[PDB]
From a paper:
Adenomatous polyposis coli ([name]) is an important human tumor suppressor protein which plays critical roles in diverse cellular processes such as Wnt/β-catenin signaling, cell adhesion, cell migration, mitosis and chromosomal instability, and so on. The N-terminal armadillo repeat ([name]) domain of [name] is the most conserved region among its vertebrate and invertebrate homologs, and mediates its association with a variety of binding partners including [name] membrane recruitment 1 ([name], also named as [name] for ‘Wilms tumor gene on the X chromosome’), Asef, Sam68, and IQGAP1. By recruiting [name] to the plasma membrane, [name] regulates the [name]-dependent maintenance of intercellular junctions. In addition, together with [name] and Axin, [name] promotes ubiquitination and degradation of β-catenin, thus negatively regulates the Wnt signal transduction pathway.
When the percentage of conservation for each [name] residue was carefully examined, another highly invariant sequence block between the A1 and A2 sites, residues 365–375, was found. Similar to the core A1 and A2 sequences, it also contains an acidic residue in the middle and several hydrophobic residues at its C-terminal part. To further understand the molecular basis of how [name] recognizes [name], we determined the crystal structures of the [name]–[name]/[name]-A1, [name]–[name]/[name]-A2, and [name]–[name]/[name]-A4 complexes to 1.90 Å, 2.00 Å, and 1.70 Å resolutions, respectively. Despite possessing apparently different sequences, [name]-A1, -A2, and -A4 adopt remarkably similar conformations when bound to [name]–[name], both in anti-parallel manners with respect to the armadillo repeats of [name]. At all three interfaces between [name]–[name] and [name]-A1/A2/A4, four highly conserved asparagine residues, N507/N550/N594/N641 from the H3 helices of armadillo repeats 2/3/4/5 of [name]–[name] function as rivets fastening [name]-A1/A2/A4 onto its surface groove. In addition, two basic residues, [name]-K516 and -R549, straddle the middle portion of [name]-A1/A2/A4 peptides on both sides. They form salt bridges with a conserved acidic residue A1-D330/A2-D503/A4-E370 and make hydrogen bonds with the main chain carbonyl groups of A1-C328/A1-G329/A2-S501/A2-G502/A4-G368. Furthermore, a number of hydrophobic residues F458, M503, and F510 from [name] cluster together and form hydrophobic contacts with non-polar residues such as I332/A333 from [name]-A1, L505/T506 from [name]-A2, and M372/A373 from [name]-A4. Accordingly, point mutations of T326R/T326A, D330K/D330A, and I332D in [name]-A1 eliminated its binding with [name]–[name]; the S499A, D503K/D503A, and L505D mutations in [name]-A2 undermined its complex formation with [name]–[name]; and the E370K point mutation or deletion of residues 370–373 in [name]-A4 eliminated its interaction with [name]–[name].
Author numbering:
A (entry chain B): 365 to 375
B (entry chain A): 403 to 741
Write the structure that this text describes.
Amino acid sequence: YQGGGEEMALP
Amino acid sequence: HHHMLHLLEQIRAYCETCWEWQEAHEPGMDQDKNPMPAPVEHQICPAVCVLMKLSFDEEHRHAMNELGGLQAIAELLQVDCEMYGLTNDHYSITLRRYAGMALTNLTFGDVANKATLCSMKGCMRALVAQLKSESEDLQQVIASVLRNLSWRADVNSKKTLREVGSVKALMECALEVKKESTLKSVLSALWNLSAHCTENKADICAVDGALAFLVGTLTYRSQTNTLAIIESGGGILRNVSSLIATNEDHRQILRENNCLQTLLQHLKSHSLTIVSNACGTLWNLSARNPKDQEALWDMGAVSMLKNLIHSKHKMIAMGSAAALRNLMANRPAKYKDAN
């Protein structure tokens, strides 16, 4: 499965 | 948001000057001696820095999206990559980082923007090429974009991500990164990509040293006391395990690193994701291989798997039971002879 997800940029 | 519009116009104008220049100066062809634009002379990095900072806020993102901010930022990232290549110039690295951060923020949770960015083939190629940057911070930013694009990818996006070579590039990148945060982004993108098709799974397994590295991640020790690397490394391993199962050479790489024994320890993890990934990997490794079947019997796998078949999490339930029935269908001779 696609468990990798998504995320915002690191500040 | 008139100043934001102004900043987008600044960068679109700079791109226009660059494209006109590229069009009119093909190496080997007749051309004037007018110099190639340099972003430092047009205040570009400050512009994208401000846009990157605004992009953290959903209200500014909404205003960017109305103005075509994603395409303008992507075009700038692409054109700087094409003009200058893999450079250690600080200004160039900094502008590309800030552009990538904005693209990461603008793709997060945003179906239409992901589709748009994947459609920018030239930009997609530029992104993949930046994984070879000596700037690990830039690598992290690029992997963050690729992670977001690979999550819930539509058919077109899946095809584009494969065709631009993102899988091999990310796996090769993983082998050399030093910081946990870079590795997190890179493995998360690979966890998404490795579910898309069989070819992506093969491409991961084909990279020299990739499987040993993935097995290694199952016992990675986070300096930040999180389980993100074990979860993502193990998630990729689970996704490619269907191929591993029919490759003796690849099984042997796993054995040299005691993979099966580690996956059994993972069945006792307090993390459902870790347990789920382990159940999925064992489902495949328990099939059609007398050596690893016997090894699992000998390591007490039957009881450990039996413990999980009532779980209520689809994949833990499915994988634990599928691995158990593989082992039960293939009771080793030495057990049968001992009755």
